[PDB]
Structure 1
Amino acid sequence: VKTFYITAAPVGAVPKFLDPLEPKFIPHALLELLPADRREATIKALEANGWEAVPAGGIVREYGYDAPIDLTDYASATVHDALRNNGWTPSGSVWHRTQTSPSLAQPPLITRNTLERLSSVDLVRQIVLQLTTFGWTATEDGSLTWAHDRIHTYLSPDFVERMRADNAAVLDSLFENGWRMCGAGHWQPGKARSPYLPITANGIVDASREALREGAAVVHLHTRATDDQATLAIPGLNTPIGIGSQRNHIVLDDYDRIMPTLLDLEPSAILNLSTSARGDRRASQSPLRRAHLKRYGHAQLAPDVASFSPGPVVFQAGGGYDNPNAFLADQLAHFAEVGVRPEIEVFNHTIVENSVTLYQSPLVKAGVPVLFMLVAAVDQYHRDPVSGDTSDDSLIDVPTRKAIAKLLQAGTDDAHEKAVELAATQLRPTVEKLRDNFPSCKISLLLPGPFQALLVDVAIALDLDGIRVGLEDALNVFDARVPGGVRKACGTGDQVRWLRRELERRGIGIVDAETLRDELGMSRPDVALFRQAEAALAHYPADERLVSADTILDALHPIVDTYRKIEDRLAAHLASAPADPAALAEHVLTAARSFGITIRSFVEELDRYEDHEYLVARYIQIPQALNFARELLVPRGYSIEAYDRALEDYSYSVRVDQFKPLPLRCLEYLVGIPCRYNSDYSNVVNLGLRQSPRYSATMALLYHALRELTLELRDRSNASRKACGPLWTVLETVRRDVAPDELAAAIASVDWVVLPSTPTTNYPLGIKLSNGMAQLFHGFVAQIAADPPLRLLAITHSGRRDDGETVIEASMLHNRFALNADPSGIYFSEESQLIYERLILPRLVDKPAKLAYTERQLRINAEQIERLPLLKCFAHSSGIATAQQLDVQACRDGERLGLTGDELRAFFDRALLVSFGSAADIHLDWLGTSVVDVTAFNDVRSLAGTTSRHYVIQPGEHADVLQHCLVHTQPADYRYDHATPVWQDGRQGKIVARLTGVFLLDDHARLDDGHSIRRYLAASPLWLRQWIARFHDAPADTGAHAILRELQ
């Protein structure tokens, strides 16, 4: 019931990146070896970058960082002895290290048992924090280890003493494992630094992606300047020291890279850009503070949120920036023209007071709900303009912060509650003040460093809307597996994961980006466009008998115009001269995807091709994109001379009068908005649209118009004429196939019936596909036969209807969605009837009946109802829809023939269904066949055709497996064993086995091509095959009995 939305802040202004592969200690001798001038410059540069001079007594673990020292490039008795004592031997002017430490053949490991030997828990933490700052990692065991082929880890004398004092053992093991004593020199403690802080564009993109997949809905961004970036060369070290301010600064070139990438890879992610001038107060009124707030990418989208502080920001720790009123007014004016909603960064009480009075009206006008960010536990100053005196303006007063910090150190549960109460009591007046002056507002909380232990409890107490985490606020993360309980955070995603699991523990859920965009009124344009169509068709029934395509097209007129403008922009971009080989397709497809237009691979796309009979179709993707480009440029008058390079391929050119008209292209676009892929097939977006009340009806109507327009285009082509009525084919043991015409004996002789999918209609290509699917299913079950005379029956749909209308893909898709929108089991197609009456109807009669020339038709025996043989059916794609339409017709005849409701249940218990990639909803509360349902998350076509939430993967266990398999090589080995069956019982006894967490890898270990029946069967787990094995090798038995046994 209670939910938070998580903001991730991966960069920030203050913390700095520290390279794990840089030396962390410089002996005195190495510096003293320099000339006085260069030595002074080097040392002061080091000390400005965190390096601290340190006496002898520290220990080091180094390997691989030596370099020869030629004194000609720059001895002394004080130097010469130090070098020799530190293991250097001279050879004229050249020094080199002959002393060498143990290699890293076997990773350095400080065991959990070794650390736990130490008495002081505070000492353990500082050790764990120091090593993890240096790039050491924590094992699952709870130990510390080093993975790289070089190492240079140092600990100060202070560490060594306390280690020796606490336990003069523990220090033992380091010495026994290659660590050794050092002299005086300089040391990099890495204070306010981390090896995981992203300061480059690519690093920031990656950190954002990690945060989002862990559950973050909003990403707070900063960028860092590199104008003062330099490297120090140290004598005797083969790796230079990186120096620079890494100053908080708005870098336009970085955002020019970051934003389009995120828009492509993370389309729904709410992007929040910092306008902060922290680190450069003299630029407080600079237009640079809004220069990054513009439209990015081909989609021309702006950031959704930008930082806004109605008052001065003055940190007690130093730094800060001013926010003059005219400047802020220019900001708000600019935000409005670009579509940016401000987020009020509430640093101090003056901000609050300015917000609820003078800025109250301008902020409401800036868009509702008003967004607030509570920067709590960060010491702030107010400065008197007259005297210059400072006072505490912090949300939590400094005495209270210092108090709270002490209770956190106590570590006891009682000190925690007192800490929470202190924090909440101080923040409550501010929270209440904001709610009282802003009827529509969202308030989030952030806490710096140690106080993050209060983050969840305080946020709950104040009933806040959002919680923020990230490296910007804290560099550590709590981990109970680690001695001390705390370690360096391996990124913001690490902390988001911690926060998410913490909320899960308390039964508190989180809000994803898509849902939040609705709550804040920030829905994406394509989502808005689809809902605009949903609204325009809201009063039309999903029944094809009650509405015409012309009427549907007429209602979508303003939306077609909206799409036309998008297509114009894609056309212009394509007409901007490129490439010569068949890589034009790669160019076109990338351009199309970026503009939101998804070029789909239709099986029946060859219907538009003149010379289809002489086409190979294995290279049918390349000309799809080519003709698509031609299809867009020709009507507008653009040259297609670059294209028609399909001549250099093996016509594939599509005739001009086979070009799709504008409204048809619009319809194709609209039905492609739900369940989109991101740019590189890493994820599925726009999953929310499925949950709309009018979703299925809208899709049914869209495909209705799409069917009409496509058929008209097919009637003017030399596409293969289709045949009336279904085909029946038996496969026994490569399988041999026969073609029954009027035999009920085939049904009795066969183990498995294979229902038709969408493309398997009665015509040359359709039969070929129908055969291939049948062969795949028979090779699948036959393989199961040889593990711990196989006969199959395959059904092909009718290619023509009663009125002579051709059956195409859109016809089946409409039927699919129309079935979804049917509340009572009353809807069924003509194609379903032909299959039903010849396959299912005889199971309800007493004897052979009369069948017409169209193969359509013209009692009970309750004792023999249990005697009916178990009908085992395979289903794929739209197969589950066709199946449920058979159940509907059975009820219609069964009720007409007369049977108890329980009798019909017994009738349906004599049948079984296994569906791979269910592209239609399973009506759980209907009378019908029990189903085992296996549908993949990346099966976008099945997803778009369904409304069940079980198919959607959210951050968790299944999401973990998915991301592991995204980086894993050898995709052919992949099986979805991790899949979890969910079990449901309907009102009328229908049983559904829903597998969750299922997904299918492609050849590039991505998520494309997730509808192939091959991958569904290929990646099938061993435990699943056992179920089918039990199904196959079963006596005269019931479904409910057989399936219920599988629940143990």
Structure 2
Amino acid sequence: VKTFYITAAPVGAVPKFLDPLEPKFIPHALLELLPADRREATIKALEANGWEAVPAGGIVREYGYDAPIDLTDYASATVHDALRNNGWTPSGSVWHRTQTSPSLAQPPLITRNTLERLSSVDLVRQIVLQLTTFGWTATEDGSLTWAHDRIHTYLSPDFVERMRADNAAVLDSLFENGWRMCGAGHWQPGKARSPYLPITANGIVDASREALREGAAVVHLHTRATDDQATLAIPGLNTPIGIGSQRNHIVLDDYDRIMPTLLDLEPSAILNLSTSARGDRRASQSPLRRAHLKRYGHAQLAPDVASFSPGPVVFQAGGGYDNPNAFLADQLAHFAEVGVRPEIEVFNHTIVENSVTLYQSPLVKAGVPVLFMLVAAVDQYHRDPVSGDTSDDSLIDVPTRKAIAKLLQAGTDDAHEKAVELAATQLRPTVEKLRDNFPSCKISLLLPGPFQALLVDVAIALDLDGIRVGLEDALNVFDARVPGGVRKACGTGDQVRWLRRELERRGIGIVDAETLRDELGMSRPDVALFRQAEAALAHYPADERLVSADTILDALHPIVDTYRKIEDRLAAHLASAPADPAALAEHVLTAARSFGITIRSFVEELDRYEDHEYLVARYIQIPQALNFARELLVPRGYSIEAYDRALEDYSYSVRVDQFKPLPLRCLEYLVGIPCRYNSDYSNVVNLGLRQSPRYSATMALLYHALRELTLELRDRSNASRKACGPLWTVLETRRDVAPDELAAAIASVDWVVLPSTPTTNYPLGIKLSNGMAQLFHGFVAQIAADPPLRLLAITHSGRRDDGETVIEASMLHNRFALNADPSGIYFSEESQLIYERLILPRLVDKPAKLAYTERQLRINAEQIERLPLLKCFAHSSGIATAQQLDVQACRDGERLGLTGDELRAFFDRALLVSFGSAADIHLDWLGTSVVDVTAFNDVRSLAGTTSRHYVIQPGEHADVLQHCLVHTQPADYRYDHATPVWQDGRQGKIVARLTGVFLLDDHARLDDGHSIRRYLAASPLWLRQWIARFHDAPADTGAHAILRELQ
């Protein structure tokens, strides 16, 4: 019931990046070899960058960092011996190392057992912390290992002495593994440094991505200047030492790269940019502190949140920045004009004071709820403007912080609670004071370094709204597998994972970015626009009989206008001259996706093409993108001369008469907003829209108008005329016959294949209907040869009573309208033609009279159990068509009178296996039991459903997905990890819902997730076992079959 929202802070201002592949020790002989001035400059540059002078007595494990030393570039008696002592040999003016160290043929490893031999738990930690700082990584075993082809790890004499004293055998182990003693010189302890800290645009983007997929909802960003970036060239070393301030600074070119990238890959993520002037107090009133707060990308979106501190920030550790009132006034003014919400970084008590009094009104006016960030356990000063004397203005006073730090080191549970009580008692006045003066506000907590052990407990005690972690606050992460229980954090995502799993222990949930935007009142434009349509149609019934497309289009009028303005911006961008091959489509596609417009791949898109009979429907992607551009540029007056280059392809040109009107393109956009892909098909966004009460009804109304306008366009084309009524087809061993009036086909056949959306009664539809059928029979037939197969394929009616053509939109409206049906009463004419000739005979007694349109015109309760098991496959719209068969069965069953309980026995004689259910499964309805296999990236099925079981959240399933995105090859992929969830309906219906299912495409991505082929291809062996058991079965019941499968 209790939830937090996690803020991730990847960059920060203080910690620095330290390259693992840099030398960590420089022998004095190598520096002393330099000329006096160069030696002096080099040393002071090293010491400025964390390098500490150190005597002999330390050990090193080095390989691959040697380089020749030509003295002509600059001998000495004191040096000469030191060089030869360190394994160097002269050759005139040239020195080189003949001394050899053990290669890295097999990775150096310090076992957990070796570490545990040490008595001091304190010593072990610092050893683990030092090596992990150098790039060493902990294993699942709990050991430390080095994976790179070079190595240069050094430990100080202090380490060696304490190691020797605690246990000399451990130290000897290093000696037998290639470590060796060192002379005097300089080394890099890497204090306040990490090999995982991101200071480049690409690094920051990656770090943010990692944190977000682990559960973070907000990303707090910094940037680092590189204006003093330099490298030191040390003699005898083939790798230079990176020096630089890595100063905290607002870099506009970095954000120009970071922000659009994050908007593309992480659309729902709440971006929080730092406005801090820490590291440059003299620029406290610079307009640069808001220069990065603008509209980014083609979507012209701004950062959602920016840092804001009502008062000076003065660190006791040194540094800080001032926030003058005129400046802060300009900030808030700019924040408002751009659409940015301030987050109050509460550093001091003076910040609190200024927040609940003078800035109280302006902060509320800036937007509600007001966001607060409690910078706890960070020592602060207040400076008397007259005397200059400093007082302790920290949220947690320095005496109490020092106290808490001691109890943390005690490690006992008793000192922990006393530490929590100390932190909570100190912070509670500030929390209460903020909430008493701000009726609508959110408050988050951060803790630096060691205090992070209190982060969860203190946040719970104060009933806070959010918790912040990241490399900005701490560079370590708690790991119980590691000796000492602590190691270097492999990025912010590592720490976010720790926090999430920590909260999961206590039964505390987390809030994803998409959900938090609703709470904070900062939802995305496209999400808002869809909800705008939902509201505009809220008072209209989902029944196609009770509302017209004209009325629906009339209600969406202002939204069509809103969409048009978006389309203008896409058109103008395309008219900004490019490309010559058919790869121009890639330009259009990328342009479309960045503006939020998804050029969907329609199977029936050929109906708009005049020469459709002379075209190959395999290469329909490149031309549809070309015509799309033409479709947008022509009505406005732009030149499409660059296009129609489809002439250099193999007309694919779409006639102007078949161009989609403005409202038609608008409807296509709206229905494409829920369950979107990100820019590179790594994730699915806008998932929350499905949980709306009016979602299905809205989608039903949309596809209604989408149908009416598409059919209108189809009637003016040479689109293949469709036929009335369904087509029945049997597949043996594949064989293919087309029965017309034979119920004998049903009895002879193992499985029935229910029709999909594009499988209608017309040349292309029949080809597709045959295809899916064949795919299904190769599938079950392949299972037969494992620890006379006949298949029945059903094709939908192509034309209804009034001569109206049956298209995709027709099936989808039927799909969504069925979702919005509370009672089991809705079905279509297409479902009727299939039902009465397939299911109805099972209800009555012996053959009846059927009309010319193949439509129709008792009980035998003892023979209800005698009915054969009807095993059916379903894909896409299949589960919708199937449940409509159940409805009609209940209506005829009630007309005949089957006492309901016997109706249950009827449905026990049927069985359903659905792959990619694109419609909701009404659990409480009377109907056929279903095994549901739906993929997470099956966005088409996702958009058609409302079940939460299809949505993957940070957990084990999310881990497998992220693993398969990089290491796993597509053809090998099988969703073994899928977890079946069992459900029992009010009226006996049983549903086996698989969770964690996803489908890899050819690029190991999440696109093309509606492929029935991939659904069957990537099918796990244990799932085949289920289907095998279904096939090899006597006259057993459905309920009995799957109840046994639960074990």
TM range (shorter): over 0.9
Counterpart CA distance in 1 for 2:875 and 2:370 is 48
Secondary structure of the residue aligned to 2:231 is strand
Counterpart CA distance in 2 for 1:447 and 1:462 is 14
Aligned counterpart, 1:397:
397
Secondary structure of the residue aligned to 1:242 is strand
Cα-to-partner distance string for 1:801-858 (whole Å, 9 max, x where unaligned)? 0000000000000000000000000000000000000000000001100000000000
Cα-to-partner distance string for 1:730-782 (whole Å, 9 max, x where unaligned)? 0000x110000000000000000000000000000000000000000000000
Counterpart CA distance in 2 for 1:482 and 1:569 is 54
Counterpart CA distance in 2 for 1:766 and 1:485 is 62
Aligned counterpart, 1:875:
874
Counterpart CA distance in 1 for 2:417 and 2:861 is 69
Counterpart CA distance in 2 for 1:528 and 1:568 is 20
Counterpart CA distance in 1 for 2:839 and 2:670 is 37
Counterpart CA distance in 1 for 2:911 and 2:759 is 22
Counterpart CA distance in 2 for 1:19 and 1:846 is 81
Counterpart CA distance in 2 for 1:843 and 1:898 is 14
Using the TM superposition, give the Cα deviation of residue 528 of structure 1 relative to its aligned residue in structure 2, in angstroms: 0.1
Cα-to-partner distance string for 1:280-310 (whole Å, 9 max, x where unaligned)? 0000000000000000000000000000000
Cα-to-partner distance string for 1:543-566 (whole Å, 9 max, x where unaligned)? 000000000000000000000000
Counterpart CA distance in 2 for 1:844 and 1:346 is 72
Secondary structure of the residue aligned to 2:999 is coil
Secondary structure of the residue aligned to 2:487 is strand
Counterpart CA distance in 2 for 1:897 and 1:673 is 45
Secondary structure of the residue aligned to 1:223 is coil
Counterpart CA distance in 2 for 1:751 and 1:167 is 73
Secondary structure of the residue aligned to 1:444 is strand
Counterpart CA distance in 1 for 2:17 and 2:969 is 34
Secondary structure of the residue aligned to 2:125 is helix
Counterpart CA distance in 1 for 2:932 and 2:334 is 52
Secondary structure of the residue aligned to 1:503 is helix
1:395-434 to 2 correspondences below 5 Å: 395-434=395-434
Cα-to-partner distance string for 1:336-367 (whole Å, 9 max, x where unaligned)? 00000000000000000000000000000000
Counterpart CA distance in 1 for 2:584 and 2:154 is 55
Counterpart CA distance in 2 for 1:732 and 1:361 is 77
Using the TM superposition, give the Cα deviation of residue 76 of structure 1 relative to its aligned residue in structure 2, in angstroms: 0.7
Gaps of 5+ in 1: none
Using the TM superposition, give the Cα deviation of residue 916 of structure 1 relative to its aligned residue in structure 2, in angstroms: 0.1
Counterpart CA distance in 2 for 1:313 and 1:319 is 8
Secondary structure of the residue aligned to 2:736 is strand
Counterpart CA distance in 1 for 2:961 and 2:969 is 14
Using the TM superposition, give the Cα deviation of residue 901 of structure 1 relative to its aligned residue in structure 2, in angstroms: 1.0
Q: Is 1:820 aligned to residue 819 of structure 2? A: yes
Cα-to-partner distance string for 1:897-945 (whole Å, 9 max, x where unaligned)? 1111110000000000000000000000000000000000000000000
Counterpart CA distance in 1 for 2:115 and 2:749 is 67
Aligned counterpart, 1:150:
150
Using the TM superposition, give the Cα deviation of residue 601 of structure 1 relative to its aligned residue in structure 2, in angstroms: 0.3
Using the TM superposition, give the Cα deviation of residue 79 of structure 1 relative to its aligned residue in structure 2, in angstroms: 0.2
Counterpart CA distance in 2 for 1:754 and 1:108 is 58
Cα-to-partner distance string for 1:576-603 (whole Å, 9 max, x where unaligned)? 0000000110000000000000000000
Counterpart CA distance in 2 for 1:270 and 1:982 is 32
TM-score if structure 2 supplies the norm length?
A: 1.00
Cα-to-partner distance string for 1:255-296 (whole Å, 9 max, x where unaligned)? 000000000000000000000000000000000000000000
Counterpart CA distance in 1 for 2:491 and 2:939 is 31
Q: Is 1:261 aligned to residue 230 of structure 2? A: no
Aligned counterpart, 1:231:
231
Counterpart CA distance in 1 for 2:183 and 2:601 is 69
Cα-to-partner distance string for 1:157-182 (whole Å, 9 max, x where unaligned)? 00000000000110000000000000
Counterpart CA distance in 1 for 2:262 and 2:82 is 53
Counterpart CA distance in 1 for 2:569 and 2:788 is 59
Cα-to-partner distance string for 1:450-484 (whole Å, 9 max, x where unaligned)? 00000000000000000000000000000000000
Aligned counterpart, 2:652:
652
Cα-to-partner distance string for 1:368-402 (whole Å, 9 max, x where unaligned)? 00000000000000000000000000000000000
Counterpart CA distance in 1 for 2:429 and 2:580 is 67
Using the TM superposition, give the Cα deviation of residue 970 of structure 1 relative to its aligned residue in structure 2, in angstroms: 2.0
% of aligned pairs identical? 100
1:195-206 to 2 correspondences below 5 Å: 195-206=195-206
Cα-to-partner distance string for 1:592-642 (whole Å, 9 max, x where unaligned)? 000000000000000000000000111100000000000000000000000
Q: Is 1:282 aligned to residue 282 of structure 2? A: yes
Aligned counterpart, 2:26:
26
Counterpart CA distance in 2 for 1:883 and 1:294 is 51
Cα-to-partner distance string for 1:93-127 (whole Å, 9 max, x where unaligned)? 00000001000001000000000000000000000
TM-score if structure 1 supplies the norm length?
A: 1.00
Secondary structure of the residue aligned to 2:634 is helix
Counterpart CA distance in 2 for 1:168 and 1:740 is 87
Aligned counterpart, 1:839:
838
Counterpart CA distance in 1 for 2:901 and 2:617 is 50
Secondary structure of the residue aligned to 1:543 is coil
Cα-to-partner distance string for 1:477-520 (whole Å, 9 max, x where unaligned)? 00000000000000000000000000000000000000000000
Counterpart CA distance in 1 for 2:65 and 2:726 is 75
Secondary structure of the residue aligned to 1:838 is coil
Counterpart CA distance in 1 for 2:57 and 2:740 is 94
Aligned counterpart, 1:39:
39
Aligned counterpart, 2:981:
982
Using the TM superposition, give the Cα deviation of residue 969 of structure 1 relative to its aligned residue in structure 2, in angstroms: 4.4
Cα-to-partner distance string for 1:128-148 (whole Å, 9 max, x where unaligned)? 000000000000000000000
Secondary structure of the residue aligned to 2:417 is helix
Cα-to-partner distance string for 1:861-912 (whole Å, 9 max, x where unaligned)? 0000000000000000000000000000000000001111110000000000
Aligned counterpart, 2:679:
679
Counterpart CA distance in 2 for 1:886 and 1:133 is 64
Counterpart CA distance in 1 for 2:905 and 2:899 is 10
Counterpart CA distance in 2 for 1:968 and 1:827 is 46
Aligned counterpart, 2:946:
947
Counterpart CA distance in 2 for 1:235 and 1:728 is 82
Counterpart CA distance in 2 for 1:899 and 1:586 is 59
Counterpart CA distance in 1 for 2:781 and 2:56 is 74
Counterpart CA distance in 2 for 1:463 and 1:340 is 26
Counterpart CA distance in 2 for 1:563 and 1:701 is 18
Cα-to-partner distance string for 1:36-72 (whole Å, 9 max, x where unaligned)? 0000000000000000000000000000000000000
What RMSD over aligned residues (CA atoms) do the two structures have, in Å? 0.3
Cα-to-partner distance string for 1:1025-1045 (whole Å, 9 max, x where unaligned)? 000000000000100000100
Q: Is 1:249 aligned to residue 249 of structure 2? A: yes
Secondary structure of the residue aligned to 1:588 is helix
Using the TM superposition, give the Cα deviation of residue 971 of structure 1 relative to its aligned residue in structure 2, in angstroms: 1.1
Cα-to-partner distance string for 1:703-735 (whole Å, 9 max, x where unaligned)? 0000000000000000000000000000000x1
Counterpart CA distance in 2 for 1:947 and 1:896 is 32
Secondary structure of the residue aligned to 1:737 is coil
Using the TM superposition, give the Cα deviation of residue 213 of structure 1 relative to its aligned residue in structure 2, in angstroms: 0.1
Counterpart CA distance in 1 for 2:261 and 2:905 is 56
Aligned counterpart, 1:52:
52
Counterpart CA distance in 2 for 1:323 and 1:637 is 51
Q: Is 1:330 aligned to residue 321 of structure 2? A: no
Counterpart CA distance in 1 for 2:265 and 2:257 is 12
Secondary structure of the residue aligned to 2:196 is coil
Secondary structure of the residue aligned to 1:839 is coil
Aligned counterpart, 1:442:
442
Secondary structure of the residue aligned to 1:603 is coil
Aligned counterpart, 1:776:
775
Counterpart CA distance in 2 for 1:151 and 1:404 is 39
Secondary structure of the residue aligned to 1:40 is helix
Q: Is 1:298 aligned to residue 298 of structure 2? A: yes
